[PDB]
């Protein structure tokens, strides 16, 4: 009984916009079978979900439910349209978006793997050496596998607070960084990517236990990025280390502005940086991209005629379905917990 | 119509129907072959002329032909039902290998043709049986003493601790210390007699040193037992010295921490914000917890280890010996849980890996 399952899922009190979209798409794709007439809305909603565009996807879901209702369940549609106005997003607990972004980062790594050659990172080694300060290291080893390139780009963390200060000072939108300073320490976790430790997870989606940082949100700062963009999972904050990558990449682009395939190379670099800051829980997708899309930082890519893909993929279906299953499980579990609690309160009242 | 519940164990399998209050078939998890094949109690009668293998070792299934045989016995010989007509819920050890989950799901759907099924963590069921969703379950049984903290129905795998210290080791320890008193207990039947002595007379002393002093300075604790052959044995301090091998595993030549320190450690591997709700929600389970005084001993030990300003509540149900199975029937009888089963359709779609996405 899919309608009963979805109506039970929709009763959750912690439901958010991400869970709304995932559950609504699951319901509509289960009711409406695989039809060519309809497989232009599901992918549209997947793309609108990938870009944190939740108001538009919610409106499209509601309109698609108004039409086609002869093939749907009237009470489920009414429940959907009743839940929709009251939904919000909590940056602390977008636990469906966290799973989605983790699986997306894994897929982005897997698709950058299908690249011909890693020559871009070997060429970027020289640009890193030219800009690496005295209080840093020097890269001399040839890069042959993705892991070497990942460690190489992650090593740009040494450039922070030394060379990227002039780049941060001029470009706005960073004064709105909402990363709590209070060092809360570390905590064990077996949850990959930007997932939280205590949250559930599939048993085939587990990584070896390790200490992960405990970062809170600075609510005191007015107009923080977590308030103006509630829909993004708060992992650390707006990605302040992406300025180091930007400095290195400005050097690389200035040295390679005349390259035939500079666009593909810079896309490879940016995509690996994005899929590596999520696969290791430093930052979430939009925490990096909202830095990468700053106009003062878009000027560098505009002068060289660089079209940033921003990691956008042509098939994000698999992690969408996995997030659908995740939200289904979570909401049905919450419903069962409520039924359990009431079933025991009844016994307590009776005796 | 009724959904079967099958809690599996290294020693004893507990099988029955959802909605009940106790299993209808609790039988040994053994398979015997001549020294055909027999399972459980029927292999119990011929223990002398059969090779009794335990397909679950330390909570984790190791033999799968033997587990298929036990499940066939449970279905066609103990509950007298057909699995094709009922949704068969099952139980798994914490931190179960994922290949084992896939194998049990494949067995359920391909050799017994169950219309639906599900796999739940035994400690989570034990926490449900007390009407709880957050708390730490100290599931001490026959093969393994697991310590599982649970947050809103999820068993946190980054804090689940295992302990190879359970009832079988205690029975062997009691055999050893009975031999250290002149009573020859070495063979198998001697193991059954000593296990019966341990169930009937042993208890957890609140103060081991003071209890030893009292047992040496008097004979009030000195109790009596009768062998099948008619001989009468007498057990003194050895009553409270056997279960102590759970709070001081060094008695068995093990460098472990003991169930109290294992529990405190497993709590300490958790977030600081859920530690208050893990202390005050400590649930005990399993047979090796059916010791008089074990709950107050756990209370005192945890109060020693835990901070001195946070409340601690050890929860020992009188039915704790079955808290798993009870929690498996409080679950497989809920109306919401009727949507959580893995349908045969879902299996035929997603392969044996559907268990990872449905039963998380
Ligand atoms: N009253 C009792 N007091 C102490 N111990 C007992 C009592 N009754 C049974 N036991 C012990 O408990 C063991 C079986 O307990 P239980 O069924 O909880 O474990 P299990 O689930 O079969 O094993 P596992 O935990 O490895 O799956 C037996 O070996 C027995 O020695
Ligand atoms: C009464 C009972 C319970 C039990 O815990 O028994 C199970 C099963 C038993 C093996 C079967 C045996 C031939 C007879 C069955 C006894 C079943 O091994 C155990 O007794 C082991 C051996 S000593 C011990 O403490 N556990 C556990
Ligand atoms: P954002 O760039 O603000 O980073 C926030 C914290 O994540 C850690 N971090 C960032 N980048 C790295 C690398 N490459 N390696 C290890 N740790 C990293 C920093 O501690 C930041 O404080
Ligand atoms: Ca058990």
User: Residues A334, A271: one domain?
Assistant: no
Measured between alpha carbons, how far is B236 from B251 in angstroms, rounded to an integer? Answer: 17
Scan for tokens 């979900």, then name that residue: A49
Spatial contact of A324 and B358, defined as CB atoms under 8 Å apart? no
Cα–chain center distance at B261: 19
Q: Is A339 on the interface with B (CB under 8 A)?
A: yes
CB contact under 8 A, B131 and A325: no
Spatial contact of B49 and B34, defined as CB atoms under 8 Å apart? yes
User: Residues A133, A172: one domain?
Assistant: yes
Listed residue (A52, A44, A99) closest to A329, CA to CA = A99
In this structure, what DSSP letter does residue B2 have?
Answer: P
Residues in chain B: 360
User: Residues B148, B272: one domain?
Assistant: yes
Q: Is B339 on the interface with A (CB under 8 A)?
A: yes
User: Residues B208, B310: one domain?
Assistant: no
Interval between CA B30 and ligand 2 midpoint (Å): 9
> Does any ligand 1 atom lie closer than 6 A to the CB of residue B66?
no
Bin B58: left if φ > 0, else alpha if -120 < ψ < 50, else beta. left
Which one of A26, A191, A323, A340 makes the best mutation probe of the B interface by having the most chain B beta carbons within 10 Å? A340
Residue nearest to atom 6 of ligand 2 (CA): B11
Listed residue (B101, B98, B160) closest to B127, CA to CA = B160
Question: Does residue A309 lie within any of the structural domains?
Answer: no
Measured between alpha carbons, how far is A177 from A184 in angstroms, rounded to an integer? Answer: 18
Point out the ligand 3 atom lying closest to the alpha carbon of residue A177: 3
* Residue B182: partners with Cβ closer than 8 Å, 6 or more residues away: none
Listed residue (B174, B127, B169, B130) closest to B151, CA to CA = B127
Listed residue (B140, B173, B144, B164) closest to B255, CA to CA = B164
User: Residues A69, A184: one domain?
Assistant: no
In chain A, whose CA is at the least distance from the CA of B343? Answer: A1
Mark which residues 40-69 of A lie under 8 Å from B by CB. Answer: none
**CA B256, B245, B288, B283 torsion: positive or negative?**
negative
3-state helix vs strand vs coil in chain A, percent to 5: 55, 5, 40
Question: Is A188 exposed, middle or buried (CB count within 10 Å of its CB: 0-12, 13-18, 19+)?
Answer: middle
User: Residues A276, A326: one domain?
Assistant: no
Measured between alpha carbons, how far is A337 from B319 in angstroms, rounded to an integer? Answer: 22
> Does any ligand 3 atom lie closer than 6 A to the CB of residue A281?
no
Residue nearest to atom 21 of ligand 3 (CA): A282
Mark which residues 308-327 of A lie under 8 Å from B by CB. Answer: 322, 325-326
**CA B97, B99, B102, B104 torsion: positive or negative?**
negative
Residues of A in contact with B353 (CB under 8 A): 204
CB contact under 8 A, A197 and B158: yes
CB contact under 8 A, A340 and B274: no
Token pair, residue B316, equals 């020992």
In chain A, whose CA is at the least distance from the CA of B124? Answer: A337
Domain count for chain A, please give it. Answer: 2
Spatial contact of A200 and A96, defined as CB atoms under 8 Å apart? no
- Half-sphere exposure of A180 toward its Cβ, with a 13 Å CA cutoff? 14
Spatial contact of B104 and B140, defined as CB atoms under 8 Å apart? no
Spatial contact of A252 and A206, defined as CB atoms under 8 Å apart? no
At B31, give phi and psi (nearest 5°).
Answer: -130, 130
Chain A with chain B: Cβ pairs closer than 8 A: 83
Question: Does residue A238 lie within any of the structural domains?
Answer: yes
- Provide the residue range defining the domain that includes B67: 2-122+324-360
> Does any ligand 1 atom lie closer than 6 A to the CB of residue B167?
yes
Listed residue (A90, A68, A79) closest to A8, CA to CA = A79
User: Residues A195, A125: one domain?
Assistant: yes
Question: Does residue A62 lie within any of the structural domains?
Answer: yes
Question: Does residue A308 lie within any of the structural domains?
Answer: no
Rounded to a whole number, what is the distance in Å from the CA of A245 to chain B's nearest CA?
33
User: Residues B112, B6: one domain?
Assistant: yes
User: Residues A115, A153: one domain?
Assistant: yes
Rounded to a whole number, what is the distance in Å from the CA of B339 to chain A's nearest CA?
6
Which of A179, A236, A275 is the best mutation target for the ligand 3 pocket, counting ligand atoms within 8 Å of the beta carbon and taking the most? Answer: A236
Measured between alpha carbons, how far is B78 from A270 in angstroms, rounded to an integer? Answer: 62
Helix (H, G, I), strand (E, B) or coil at B34: strand
Spatial contact of A240 and A297, defined as CB atoms under 8 Å apart? no
User: Residues A172, A228: one domain?
Assistant: yes
Question: Is A161 exposed, middle or buried (CB count within 10 Å of its CB: 0-12, 13-18, 19+)?
Answer: exposed
- Provide the residue range defining the domain that includes A48: 2-88+315-350
User: Residues B139, B287: one domain?
Assistant: yes
User: Residues B28, B106: one domain?
Assistant: yes
Residues of A in contact with B331 (CB under 8 A): 336, 340
**CA B167, B173, B177, B182 torsion: positive or negative?**
positive
Considering every ligand atom, which ligand is closest to the CA of A225? 3
Residue nearest to atom 25 of ligand 2 (CA): B168
**CA A75, A78, A80, A83 torsion: positive or negative?**
negative
Listed residue (A113, A96, A52) closest to A285, CA to CA = A52
Scan for tokens 């359970």, then name that residue: B166
Point out the ligand 1 atom lying closest to the alpha carbon of residue B9: 27
In chain A, whose CA is at the least distance from the CA of B94? Answer: A203
Measured between alpha carbons, how far is A61 from A31 in angstroms, rounded to an integer? Answer: 14
User: Residues A299, A320: one domain?
Assistant: no
User: Residues B135, B196: one domain?
Assistant: no
CB contact under 8 A, A339 and B101: no
C-alpha distance across the termini of chain A, in Å: 35
User: Residues B62, B84: one domain?
Assistant: yes
Q: Which helix (H) or strand (E) holds B70?
A: helix B64-73
Residues of A in contact with B153 (CB under 8 A): 200, 333, 336-337
Residues of B in contact with A76 (CB under 8 A): none
In chain A, whose CA is at the least distance from the CA of B96? Answer: A203
Residue A187 marked ligand-binding: no
CB contact under 8 A, B158 and A344: no
Token pair, residue A215, equals 């970062």
Measured between alpha carbons, how far is A70 from A68 in angstroms, rounded to an integer? Answer: 5
User: Residues B7, B114: one domain?
Assistant: yes
Scan for tokens 């007699």, then name that residue: B193
In this structure, what DSSP letter does residue B222 have?
Answer: -
User: Residues A175, A283: one domain?
Assistant: yes
Measured between alpha carbons, how far is A26 from A324 in angstroms, rounded to an integer? Answer: 6
User: Residues A104, A143: one domain?
Assistant: yes
User: Residues A153, A240: one domain?
Assistant: yes
User: Residues B48, B118: one domain?
Assistant: yes
List pocket residues of ligand 2, CB cut-off 6 Å. Answer: B 11-12, 28, 30, 44, 47, 142, 167-168, 171, 191, 195
- For ligand 4, a single-atom ion, which residues have Cβ within 5 Å? B 9, 122, 141
Q: Point out which residues pair with A189 in neighbouring strands.
A: A210
Measured between alpha carbons, how far is A276 from A106 in angstroms, rounded to an integer? Answer: 9
Interval between CA B146 and ligand 1 midpoint (Å): 13
Residue nearest to atom 5 of ligand 1 (CA): B288
Token pair, residue A339, equals 């039924």
User: Residues A41, A132: one domain?
Assistant: no
Strands B223-226 and B31-32: what pairing?
Answer: unpaired
User: Residues B118, B129: one domain?
Assistant: no
Residues of A in contact with B328 (CB under 8 A): none
Token pair, residue B217, equals 């300075």
Spatial contact of B15 and B4, defined as CB atoms under 8 Å apart? yes
Largest distance between two CA atoms of chain B: 70
Helix B294-305 to helix B259-268 angle, to the nearest 10 degrees? 50
Measured between alpha carbons, how far is A213 from A185 in angstroms, rounded to an integer? Answer: 6
Question: Is B174 exposed, middle or buried (CB count within 10 Å of its CB: 0-12, 13-18, 19+)?
Answer: buried
Token pair, residue A193, equals 């990517």
* Residue A219: partners with Cβ closer than 8 Å, 6 or more residues away: A178
Scan for tokens 């395939």, then name that residue: A261
Spatial contact of A271 and A308, defined as CB atoms under 8 Å apart? no
Q: Is B330 on the interface with A (CB under 8 A)?
A: yes
Measured between alpha carbons, how far is B87 from A101 in angstroms, rounded to an integer? Answer: 35
Helix A317-350 to helix A17-31 angle, to the nearest 10 degrees? 100
Spatial contact of A57 and A45, defined as CB atoms under 8 Å apart? yes
Scan for tokens 């894994």, then name that residue: A106
Listed residue (A19, A43, A178) closest to A99, CA to CA = A19
Measured between alpha carbons, how far is A170 from B232 in angstroms, rounded to an integer? Answer: 92
Spatial contact of A255 and A300, defined as CB atoms under 8 Å apart? no
Rounded to a whole number, what is the distance in Å from the CA of A310 to chain B's nearest CA?
29
User: Residues B265, B313: one domain?
Assistant: yes
Q: Is A188 on the interface with B (CB under 8 A)?
A: yes
User: Residues B113, B29: one domain?
Assistant: yes
Q: Is A340 on the interface with B (CB under 8 A)?
A: yes
Residue nearest to atom 24 of ligand 2 (CA): B168
The technique is cryo-EM
At A173, give phi and psi (nearest 5°).
Answer: 75, -5
Spatial contact of B145 and B166, defined as CB atoms under 8 Å apart? yes
Domain count for chain B, please give it. Answer: 3
Task: Count CB atoms within 10 A of the CB of residue A155.
Answer: 15
CA angle B296, B298, B300 (to 5 degrees): 70
Q: Is B274 on the interface with A (CB under 8 A)?
A: yes
- CATH number, position B312: 3.30.420.40
Distances (CA, A) of B292 to A68, B172, B236, B287, B305: 65, 20, 16, 12, 22
Helix (H, G, I), strand (E, B) or coil at A90: coil
Residues of A in contact with B131 (CB under 8 A): 340-341, 343-344
């Amino acid at each position: 009984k899919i309608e009963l399952s979805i109506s039970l899922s929709l009763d959750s009190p912690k439901l958010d916009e991400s869970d709304f979209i995932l559950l609504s798409v699951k319901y509509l794709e289960k009711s409406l079978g695989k039809k060519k007439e309809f497989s232009g809305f599901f992918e549209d909603i997947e793309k609108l979900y990938f870009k944190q565009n939740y108001k538009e996807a919610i409106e499209k879901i509601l309109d698609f439910c108004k039409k086609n209702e002869s093939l749907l369940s009237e009470q489920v549609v009414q429940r959907l349209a009743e839940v929709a106005p009251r939904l919000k997003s909590n940056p602390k607990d977008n636990e469906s978006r966290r799973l989605y972004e983790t699986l997306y980062a894994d897929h982005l790594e897997s698709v950058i793997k299908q690249e011909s050659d890693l020559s871009v990172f070997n060429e970027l080694r020289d640009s890193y050496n030219a800009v690496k300060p005295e209080y840093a290291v020097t890269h001399e080893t040839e890069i042959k596998t993705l892991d070497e390139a990942k460690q190489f780009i992650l090593s740009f963390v040494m450039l922070n607070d030394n060379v990227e200060l002039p780049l941060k000072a001029q470009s706005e939108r960073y004064p709105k960084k909402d990363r709590s300073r209070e060092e809360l320490g570390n905590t064990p976790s077996a949850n990959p990517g930007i997932m939280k430790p205590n949250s559930p997870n599939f048993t085939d989606n587990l990584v070896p236990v390790r200490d992960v940082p405990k970062i809170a949100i600075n609510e005191k700062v007015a107009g923080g990025y977590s308030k103006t963009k509630p829909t993004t999972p708060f992992v650390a904050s707006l990605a302040g280390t992406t300025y180091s990558l930007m400095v290195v990449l400005t050097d690389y682009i200035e040295k390679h502005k005349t390259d035939k395939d500079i666009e593909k190379k810079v896309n490879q670099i940016i995509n690996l940086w994005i899929s590596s800051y999520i696969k290791e829980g430093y930052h979430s997708y939009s925490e990096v991209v909202d830095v990468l899309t700053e106009p003062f930082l878009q000027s560098i890519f505009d002068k060289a005629n660089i079209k940033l893909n921003y990691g956008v993929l042509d098939d994000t279906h698999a992690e969408f379905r996995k997030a659908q299953d995740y939200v289904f499980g979570l909401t049905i579990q919450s419903a069962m917990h409520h039924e359990l609690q009431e079933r025991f309160k009844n016994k307590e009242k009776l005796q | 119509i009724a959904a079967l519940v099958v809690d599996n164990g290294s020693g004893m399998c507990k099988a029955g129907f959802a909605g009940d209050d106790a299993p209808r078939a609790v039988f040994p998890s053994i398979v015997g072959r001549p020294r055909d094949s027999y399972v459980g109690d029927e292999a119990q009668s011929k223990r002398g002329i059969l090779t009794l293998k335990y397909p679950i070792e330390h909570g984790i299934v190791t033999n799968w032909d033997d587990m298929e045989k036990i499940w066939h016995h449970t279905f066609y010989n103990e509950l007298r039902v057909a699995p094709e007509e009922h949704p068969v819920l099952l139980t798994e050890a914490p931190l179960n290998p994922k290949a084992n989950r896939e194998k049990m799901t494949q067995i359920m759907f391909e050799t017994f043709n169950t219309p639906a099924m599900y796999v739940a963590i035994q400690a989570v069921l034990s926490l449900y049986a007390s009407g709880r969703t957050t708390g730490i379950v100290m599931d001490s049984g026959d093969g393994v003493t697991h310590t599982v903290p649970i947050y809103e129905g999820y068993a946190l795998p980054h804090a689940i601790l295992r302990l190879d210290l359970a009832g079988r080791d205690l029975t062997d320890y009691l055999m050893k210390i009975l031999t250290e008193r002149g009573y020859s207990f070495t063979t198998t039947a001697e193991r059954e007699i000593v296990r019966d002595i341990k169930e009937k007379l042993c208890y957890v002393a609140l103060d081991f040193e003071q209890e030893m002093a009292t047992a040496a300075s008097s004979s009030s604790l000195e109790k009596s037992y009768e062998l099948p052959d008619g001989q009468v044995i007498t057990i003194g301090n050895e009553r409270f010295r056997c279960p102590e091998a759970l709070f001081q595993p060094s008695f068995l030549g093990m460098e472990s921490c003991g169930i109290h320190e294992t529990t405190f450690n497993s709590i300490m591997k958790c977030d600081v914000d859920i530690r208050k709700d893990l202390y005050a929600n400590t649930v005990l389970s399993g047979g090796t917890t059916m010791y008089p005084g074990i709950a107050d001993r756990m209370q005192k030990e945890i109060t020693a280890l835990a901070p001195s300003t946070m409340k601690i509540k050890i929860i020992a149900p009188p039915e704790r010996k079955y808290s798993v199975w009870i929690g498996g029937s409080i679950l497989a009888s809920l109306s919401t849980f009727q949507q959580m089963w893995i349908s045969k359709q879902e299996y035929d779609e997603s392969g044996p890996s559907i268990v990872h996405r449905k039963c998380f």
